[PDB]
């Protein structure tokens, strides 16, 4: 009759229950939300309370309870859960809800070895006092549950043994800002810190996981993905392999070009035994890729590229097909088949495609990426020469084979190599694009290594970021954001460490960035457009012209200030060539939107002061980043309105943004009748994008007679992609509700 329920605290143990403290906290969290029942939450959680339960479990339970009510029809549960979680996480890090003063926090963290000591060297206590005035810890309340789960899961500084969380999102943002602009002149340094801080805490700019989890800590390893090109020599094979090992030990995604390795049967190049062909080496790269992963299979990913006409093409095309002899399969690596105009024309005219080992056709591989005229001339020339080892295949059989394997595994990608070079920032004769990265968005110059420390090699890197199309009000907010996006990334280039000499060379030489968007889908829904009808073509053209124009303007502004990238002379930009001058002509037939920007002024400003960065845009996919800002991923339409993630903490649900008002406005992935709509939008985006876009093809068997996708439809889509100048083609998804 004093039947209490004793809560136990962090070794302060016993104490009576406080159901009113709890209600206040809930009540607080609910402030401003619609359709959430605090009683409902209390009911679900109080029933699992037991006599000596620790306070931490009360919080977990009330958090879970709130999160288990998230739904399409009560979407504010995400915020109620989020806020409870944020609250708990404050107490878990700081002992109170009120974050310590920035200076104090940073000092404490430097002594504990969690933050880089240079933070205190670079900024004065007065400077930290001021940054603290920029910080707004109430922005922690804008995250959705899924976001808090990601922050807590892989962004906030923590102890991964003990489980202790040491920081709050706002210190992350403020310090990422500080580190990235730490070398700025005292005159502008803190203005920049604040501007960026704002941008990233209000989700205008998104940043890669390695960056958000690390900049501010003592590491200097921030790579997401690297591109290595293998030469036809054991030395290069060795070096390529070494480089992969170093890079997967730092969690980097690998894009390997192994197209030049000579085919099986070719002559021994004085000691180098390539009698055995590519496969054996491919296997060797796969083991290198997986050298620092879990069983010898879990973690570590890579995509390997080779020309369609390589002599072992048919054996390469089925490397991930599970039904086959173990020695003739390299299953845990995706492939990128490289095609150009002539190959497709052979398909269209029902003619043959000649296979050839690169070793035997002098100048053919080079021409393949850099000059299509020349490629044609050497190709026909070598077809006729009977001295040259070769094989014929009917183009139809080859294309179907590749499309078949693309279809079943979903991981046989395409790269249109002519598009990559005729419509690129680089001069094909000096710095051609001959491969992509893991997720087929990056397109940059690479040179083969002769030894792991070869200083004349070149490895390209992923330097990324993104604009949230859902958090900007008008496209002119992109000028400010381009500034901050480009300036922070450019700083990062100098900040971080390079494991391999050839990777520093490419970064310092061309300072290449890949900035893209996220939240595209939601953006299209607020403007009442759709993917499949062609209704968003001019909007897309208006939006990607604004993204490209401002990125170039900010990079140009930056070159004026600090100088163009050392190798700016190898870009087409240097010769006064713009993305609007080399885009694929057929786009003119699917969008009339007129350029709204002074491209001619900028063309001259570029020719005269050059660019800080040789490439600025690239549209990547993005699950994590997107989730933190509650946004639809990169440019892809959502599968459905509520997406589900698994966890140790239960089921995490996240409702698409503003489902309340836009449910009928969204066009979910399987609602699109086919791919034409979307491929048109990717082509329009490709007009302005420096590198490439990770574009997917999607088929639903329900929509076809007998549930089988015709090879006709598959090829027609492939050609639709090539006709609107799509550079690459990534995943292919099959199914009708996920």
């Amino acid at each position: 009759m004093n039947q209490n329920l004793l809560v136990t605290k962090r070794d302060g143990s016993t104490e009576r229950i406080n159901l009113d403290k709890i209600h206040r906290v809930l009540d607080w969290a609910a402030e401003g939300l619609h359709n959430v029942s605090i009683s409902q939450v209390e009911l679900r959680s109080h029933i699992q309370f037991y006599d000596g339960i620790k306070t931490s479990d009360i919080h977990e339970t009330i958090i879970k309870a709130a999160a288990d009510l998230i739904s399409r029809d009560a979407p504010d549960y995400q915020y109620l859960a989020a806020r409870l979680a944020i609250f708990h996480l404050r107490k878990k890090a700081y002992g109170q809800f009120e974050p310590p003063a920035l200076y104090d926090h940073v000092v404490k963290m430097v002594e504990m070895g969690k933050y880089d000591n240079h933070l205190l060297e670079d900024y004065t206590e007065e400077e930290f006092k001021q940054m603290d005035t920029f910080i707004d810890h109430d922005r922690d309340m804008t995250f959705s549950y899924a976001a808090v789960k990601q922050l807590e899961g892989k962004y906030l500084v923590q102890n991964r043994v003990t489980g202790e969380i040491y920081e709050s999102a706002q210190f992350l943002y403020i310090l990422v800002a500080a580190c990235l602009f730490s070398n700025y002149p005292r005159e502008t340094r803190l203005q920049y810190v604040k501007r960026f801080y704002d941008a990233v805490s209000t989700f205008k700019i998104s940043l890669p996981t390695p960056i958000m989890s690390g900049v501010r800590t003592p590491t200097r390893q921030f790579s997401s993905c690297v591109l290595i090109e293998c030469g036809d020599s054991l030395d290069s094979i060795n070096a390529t392999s070494s480089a992969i090992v170093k890079y997967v030990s730092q969690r980097a995604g690998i894009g390997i070009n192994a197209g030049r390795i000579r085919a099986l049967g070719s002559p021994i190049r004085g000691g180098e035994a390539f009698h055995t062909g590519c496969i054996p080496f491919y296997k060797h790269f796969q083991t290198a890729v997986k050298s620092c992963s879990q069983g010898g299979v879990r973690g570590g990913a890579a995509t390997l590229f080779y020309p369609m006409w390589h002599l072992e093409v048919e054996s390469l095309l089925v490397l991930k097909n599970n039904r086959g002899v173990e020695g003739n399969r390299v299953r845990h690596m995706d492939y990128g088949v490289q095609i150009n105009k002539l190959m497709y024309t052979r398909l269209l005219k029902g003619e043959d495609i000649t296979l050839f080992s690169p070793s035997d056709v002098p100048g053919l591989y080079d021409a393949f990426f850099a000059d299509q005229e020349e490629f044609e001339r050497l190709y026909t020339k070598y077809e006729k020469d009977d001295s040259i080892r070769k094989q014929r295949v009917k183009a139809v059989e080859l294309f179907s084979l590749m499309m078949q394997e693309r279809a079943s595994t979903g991981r046989i990608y395409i790269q249109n190599v002519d598009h990559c070079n005729t419509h690129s920032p680089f001069d094909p004769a000096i710095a051609p694009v001959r491969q992509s990265n893991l997720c087929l968005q990056i397109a940059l110059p690479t040179k083969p290594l002769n030894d792991v420390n070869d200083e004349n090699g070149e490895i390209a890197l992923c330097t990324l970021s993104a604009f949230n199309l859902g958090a900007i009000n008008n496209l002119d907010e992109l000028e400010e954001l381009a500034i901050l996006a480009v300036r922070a990334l450019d700083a990062l280039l100098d900040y971080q460490d390079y494991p391999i000499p050839a990777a520093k060379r490419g970064a310092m030489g061309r300072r290449t960035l890949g900035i893209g968007v996220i939240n595209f889908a939601y953006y299209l829904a607020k403007h009442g457009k759709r993917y499949s009808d062609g209704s968003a073509n001019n909007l897309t053209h208006k939006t990607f012209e604004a993204i490209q124009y401002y990125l170039l303007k900010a990079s140009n502004e930056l070159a004026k200030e600090q100088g163009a990238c050392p190798w700016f002379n190898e870009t087409t930009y240097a010769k006064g060539i713009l993305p609007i001058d080399t885009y694929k002509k057929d786009l003119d037939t699917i969008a009339n939107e007129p350029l709204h920007y002074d491209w001619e002024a900028l063309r001259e400003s570029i020719k005269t002061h050059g660019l800080r960065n040789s490439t600025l845009s690239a549209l990547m996919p993005s699950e994590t980043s997107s989730q933190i800002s509650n946004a639809t991923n990169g440019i892809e339409p959502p599968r459905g309105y509520v997406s589900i993630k698994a966890s140790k903490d239960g089921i995490l649900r996240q409702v698409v943004p503003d489902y309340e008002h836009l449910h009928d406005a969204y066009e979910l992935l399987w609602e699109m009748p086919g791919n034409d709509g979307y491929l048109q939008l990717v082509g329009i985006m490709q007009k302005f994008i420096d590198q490439s876009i990770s574009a997917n093809t999607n088929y639903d068997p329900s929509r076809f007679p007998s549930g089988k996708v015709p090879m006709q439809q598959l090829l027609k889509d492939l050609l639709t992609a090539y006709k609107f100048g799509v550079k690459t083609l990534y995943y292919q998804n099959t199914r009708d509700g996920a």
């Binding site: 163009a564 050392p566 050059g610």
Partner: peptide, 4 residues
Amino acid sequence: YLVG
């Protein structure tokens, strides 16, 4: 500017 442009390097030199």
